[PDB]
From a paper:
Desulfonation of isethionate by the bacterial glycyl radical enzyme (GRE) isethionate sulfite-lyase (IslA) generates sulfite, a substrate for respiration that in turn produces the disease-associated metabolite hydrogen sulfide. IslA belongs to the glycyl radical enzyme (GRE) superfamily, which performs diverse chemical reactions under anaerobic conditions (Backman et al., 2017). As is the case for the core architecture of all characterized GRE eliminases (Backman et al., 2017), IslA is dimeric with each monomer having a buried active site located centrally within a barrel comprised of two five-stranded half β barrels, anti-parallel to each other (β1–10), and surrounded by α helices. Gly805 and Cys468 are 5.2 Å from each other, competent for radical transfer from Gly805 to Cys468, and for the generation of a transient thiyl radical that initiates catalysis on the substrate.
Author numbering: 6 to 830
Write the structure that this text describes.
Amino acid sequence: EIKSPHEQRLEDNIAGKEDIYRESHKRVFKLLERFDGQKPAIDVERALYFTQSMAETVGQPLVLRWAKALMNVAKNITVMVQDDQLLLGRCGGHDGRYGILYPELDGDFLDIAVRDLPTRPQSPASISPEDAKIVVEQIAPFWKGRTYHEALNKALPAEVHKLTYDDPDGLISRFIVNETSSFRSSIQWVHDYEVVLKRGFNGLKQEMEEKLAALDPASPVDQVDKRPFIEATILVCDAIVLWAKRHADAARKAAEACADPVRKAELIRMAENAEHVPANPARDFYEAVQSQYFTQMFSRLEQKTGTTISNGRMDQYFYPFYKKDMEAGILTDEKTLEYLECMWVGMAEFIDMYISPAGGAFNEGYAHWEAVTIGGQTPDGRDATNDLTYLFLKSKREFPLHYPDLAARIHSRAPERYLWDVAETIKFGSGFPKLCNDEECIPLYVSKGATFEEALDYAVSGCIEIRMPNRDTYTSGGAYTNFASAVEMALYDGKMKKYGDVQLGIQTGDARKFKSWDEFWNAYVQQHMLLLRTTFIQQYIVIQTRAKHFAQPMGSVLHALCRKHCIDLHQPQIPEGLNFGYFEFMGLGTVIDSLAAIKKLVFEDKKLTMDQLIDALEANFEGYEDIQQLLRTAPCYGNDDEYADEIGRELDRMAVSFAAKYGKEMGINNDARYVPFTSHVPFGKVVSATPNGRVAWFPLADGSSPSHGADHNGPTAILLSNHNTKNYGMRARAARLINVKFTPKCVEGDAGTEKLVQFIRTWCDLKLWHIQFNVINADTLKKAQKDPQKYRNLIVRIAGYSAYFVDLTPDLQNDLIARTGHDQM
């Protein structure tokens, strides 16, 4: 009926009109028009200079090798000044959208990427013949037998390898117990950006030089274990300062050749910035943005942080600079938005490239989660809403890209003006911001060793994870576990149709011969527990293997505990640190509804037999549409239906109870999480037809959202089912991703915004970690599917992030279309 602001801006763009927000954001609109929707190009510069150094330092301490390699990167990488930009900093020589390579992580995929990336279905990338030659002749040869993925592949035992990979080289995943440490250097992370703003890398280098001079020259521990770390942090401090100085030199060369006196003044000011920061503490808001921007951009050169390096509570640590400059009359809100959005433009040019097939399937639509945290509470416990908070919401509404990854913190005393503006930003229809509940994760974290000061100042990281940038020390990518495959294995005696006669799971027998609900439930529990055992065994190998392949000198020098004990973050145990790891429960809604359909329609109501059920499944419901339609009448997750929710609660109890028992012996919290990336698409592609009516190879239920079209009792019931399927008596849990879609008419006007605010307050009281919203009409998606070039600017909320709908595979588009769009609350 009515269109959201995004849909209206979409129609104006298609009709050829100027966007209504272009004039008051003219500079950044000029910037983003130069690359919007361009297929990103692979850049080889970082990997080349990184490889050149690593090849000459083999055998030395890993963290020192990393710093020497980053210095080689800083001296040689292309430094450029883009037109109209107010910021310096870039990770490649290509102009426009670009991604870089990390051969230390997944170098064994380099030949695969060279031939498959330009035409790959998920997030493709071009590679010029000049770039391909450098890759296959100068980058790939050194890394053969040396990459992390090869080490992980050869280190998994047979029974774990069979549930991890399909081929002996680990090049193709099976999407059963999926490792995620091979397509990202680490999980999400947030640097302590305020220590750079307040002390600069010159100050950190000074602190480390005092530690270097205090070492006992006779102590073998000081000289063998501590000294290489200290030398690495000192060298990496000089590396980033040299890198910034080269940008300052480039800005002055640009200034000498510029006829425009207004641009010449800007170029000189940019040069002055790079000559002060990040070496020295920032002195105004402009320098603070440029200082933070340099650090996060240099971080991308350091390692491929999961979901791309996140940014922390910008509306807090930028605020002293904003308030001082505003009151000094050297800044305005309009100038603030220009500085910040120049940072979004720069971030939007950097594409986080996943070159393996598994990594591409996990991150459709050039997925990115560089979380920017706003709102919430102060370290002392009062509300933290300020004028910068509202500007980020304003920037997100008017800036047309799906940047930044804006996350708003909610607590029980969040101001109404704040919740109102968040609700109105959500009603814009691009999926921003995502909500994180102080009330759920803060009590969990203080329970796991965090002080209240550390927990209250948490920053969202990645999808909806939280970080305490001077307390968190765990960086190992976790397992993603396909519990929907446990249902399939319980039907077919530990086998899956996708993999033929390969004995994947327990031989629980032919489900056609099962005589009671007890017998099928036991079969599932056996496969369920098997996936859990494989998950944790795989994880422990990942922890031990990553310690031999990854170092993070810059990230470590930004961590107070790493400076204090002189040890790199990617080591398994760091003194006084807290380790928050994860394993993923995938397919919750698909698993619940499948088991509920079997319990209800087979063994309680006797409405069909196991033969009818498995006959329909093995036929993919072809000729059996009556049984498919019958299966969809069983109780489902997401309706506040205790019949279904009690099954999900027990599924959760098994995973959380297992996590609490076996995490501690790995020395970490390895908690159950329900955050999917886009892995519910490839996980679905390996699972055949399921007892809930889902056809073969269709995506699974996303995160902890209800199965597609299974929520027939309104949106609030989704909140109650999430609450009813959790186990608040235990703590071995983490986030759950909730996706809810409203029609614009559902939330129309001031009456609609009020309904959404009360909905968010109910979501908060229920201690639910996360929630997201699409506000869109179904016909918008159907028109975008049929005519994708006309609707190429349509933006939809997927899983922690928004992306262009036409960049998504048909499978993921079908996930988006099949999600229930609620017309009333």
